[PDB]
């Protein structure tokens, strides 16, 4: 097999504009759940006031991709989001999307609601045709696939909760095998139908108090949530920037149940736990941290965590640490992996784990948690360094895991080269942008690495990306400079002076 | 470029004058009407 | 082994197709038992959730029964349940 990295990442989250700023939710301690009107009046049926909810929904940069204004207006907001935020992923690994355009490269897309679709289907007179092809459920995937002009796979699989996770494990088996060289990974869930809530409530899944007080002996249930989140996976030979290494990643169902279907599973989980890191050849000593699916539910957590204690706290010394984004952001029911998974990367990247909120009193059906063996980070910890670990069990009964090996790449030795002024263009749609590129890359002018990579996605046609500029870093009169470039080829003429 | 902004569903789009449809099977909710019975019918 | 009231809620294609998949096990000359508790996975191609809408139209009386038995993601992990397949449970969406 293939090395599989994790290249690029980038989405939306509740009260996130994008990842800093998530990161800077997480990270701070602020609770992103919302008791807002947004999406619908509160208390609506009775349904719980508090909710994670997105920014804004009706954005979208449609001339850049190619829509015209009569389609965009049908199109689902799920879908243009995703658009975006695929666009935003793949520069962020510091590939140049033009770079993967013909390839072979897969995408694969959790997707759990098409509540849009049904909006706009509502009349069947006034209902236009091209309504369908920007709500139906397979083009989620499609239009990625036709814009970015992929020729791998282009599926778009539910699998109730684990949707995001589950097809992160399907493009890590495409990549492993070798079908394609890169896959891009989406999880997508917006909340606009009230009644789908109330079903949730009715099924007894949500909180009253609308609080995934994970772990916590007050576990009610679950917030429904809001997130949009893509993931960029190649072979190492091609990733520019390597978040982690995914060393394994399975799946398996519980199966039959006496309880219910719905009734979550213990054993089931702690088997394919034991699986994947025994095929993987990992030990379970190098587990540093394990992002449980910490729902809440007073069911679903003292089952998971004790299968967590059976799996990897049976010979381990010292405490393995828990956490769960859930509790920082609601539970995004399609993407709520995905969501984990950019926690998991963004604290990496910073070396802190990001603390766990509503945690207050273990709960007393998990023998470990009153123990020491498992350990809730319920405040920012170093990061000591090992192998991680991320598992989300759908409530049909799917189980998804998966292992991580986080990138540990020391900052290179000081080298000559280094104090030589460097160049660094960048390109936007507006002026904003390219100021805001410029300016990033000059308060990091000493970074080689962002300083290539920044350059490396610039390339991009005049056509598309209108305004170009530039900046010289490291040079005494150096003064970013930004200007609109004319469309149409220009000849290039050399002079060779007397 | 996010200048301009794009339609989205709002909350009266979806479904919810009124029809109500009185059963009196024994499943239905409203099976007890079945006890308000005057000069022998219901 | 499905209540009669979540049997009125449960989408068509999922009824139907319950007794389908039991008649292509067996068309196979293979017991079901003997496939109880092995890795077993369960790929449906299901682009079609009608009977949600219509379930989960009247906030005042709609049931959770619905959701069980109607929603997408559902329709293989219900055969994954009553069959007891533990291998990987999907329901792509592609058209056609």
Excluded at chain 1, 323 to 346: C, D, F, I, Q, Y
Aim: glycine letters at 10%.
């Amino acid at each position: 097999p293939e090395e599989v990295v994790i290249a690029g990442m980038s989405g939306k989250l509740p009260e996130s504009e994008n990842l800093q700023e998530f990161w800077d939710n997480l990270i701070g301690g602020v609770d992103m759940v919302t008791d807002d009107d947004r999406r619908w009046k509160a208390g609506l049926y009775g349904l719980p006031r508090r909710s994670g909810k997105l920014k804004d929904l009706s954005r979208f940069d449609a001339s850049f991709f190619g829509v015209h204004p009569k389609q965009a207006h049908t199109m689902d907001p799920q879908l243009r989001l995703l658009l975006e935020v695929t666009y935003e992923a793949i520069v962020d690994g510091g590939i140049n999307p033009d770079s993967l355009r013909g390839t072979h490269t897969g995408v694969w897309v959790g997707v759990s609601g098409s509540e849009t679709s049904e909006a706009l289907s509502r009349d069947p007179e006034t209902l236009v045709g091209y309504s369908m092809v920007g709500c139906q459920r397979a083009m989620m995937a499609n239009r990625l696939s036709f814009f970015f002009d992929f020729r791998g796979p282009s599926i778009a699989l539910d699998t109730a909760c684990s949707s995001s996770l589950m097809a992160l494990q399907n493009a890590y088996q495409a990549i492993h095998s070798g079908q394609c060289p890169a896959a891009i990974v989406g999880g997508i869930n917006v909340l606009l139908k009230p009644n789908t809530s109330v079903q949730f409530l009715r099924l007894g899944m949500l909180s009253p108090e609308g609080t995934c007080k994970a772990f916590d002996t007050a576990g009610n249930g679950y917030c429904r949530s809001e997130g949009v989140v893509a993931v960029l996976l190649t072979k190492k030979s091609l990733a520019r920037r390597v978040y982690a290494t995914i060393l394994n990643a399975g799946t398996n169902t519980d199966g039959f149940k006496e309880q219910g279907v719905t009734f979550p599973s213990g054993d089931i989980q702690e088997q394919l736990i034991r699986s994947l890191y025994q095929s993987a050849g990992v030990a379970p000593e190098s587990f540093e941290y394990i992002e449980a699916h910490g729902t809440g539910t007073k069911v679903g957590d003292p089952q998971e965590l004790n299968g967590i204690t059976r799996a990897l706290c049976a010979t381990r010394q010292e405490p393995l640490l828990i956490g769960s984004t859930k509790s920082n952001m609601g539970h995004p029911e399609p993407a709520s992996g995905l969501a984990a998974l950019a926690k998991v990367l963004l604290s990496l990247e910073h070396g802190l784990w990001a603390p766990n909120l509503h945690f207050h009193s273990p709960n007393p059906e998990i023998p470990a948690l009153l123990d020491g063996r498992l350990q809730v980070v319920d405040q920012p910890l170093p990061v000591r360094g090992g192998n991680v670990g991320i598992n989300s069990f759908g409530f049909g009964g799917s189980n998804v895991h998966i292992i991580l090996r986080p990138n540990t790449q020391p900052p290179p030795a000081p080298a000559p080269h280094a104090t030589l002024p460097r160049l660094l263009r960048a390109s936007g749609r507006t002026p904003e942008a390219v100021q805001k590129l410029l300016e990033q890359g000059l308060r990091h002018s000493q970074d080689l690495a962002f300083l290539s990579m920044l350059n490396d996605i610039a390339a991009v046609p005049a056509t598309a990306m209108p305004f170009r500029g530039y900046a010289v870093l490291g040079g005494e009169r150096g003064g970013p400079e930004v200007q609109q470039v004319p469309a149409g080829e220009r000849p290039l003429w050399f002079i060779c002076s007397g | 470029d996010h200048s301009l902004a794009w339609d989205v569903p709002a909350a009266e789009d979806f479904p919810n004058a009124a029809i109500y449809n009185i059963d009196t099977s024994s499943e239905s909710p409203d099976h007890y009407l079945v006890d308000h019975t005057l000069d022998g019918r219901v």
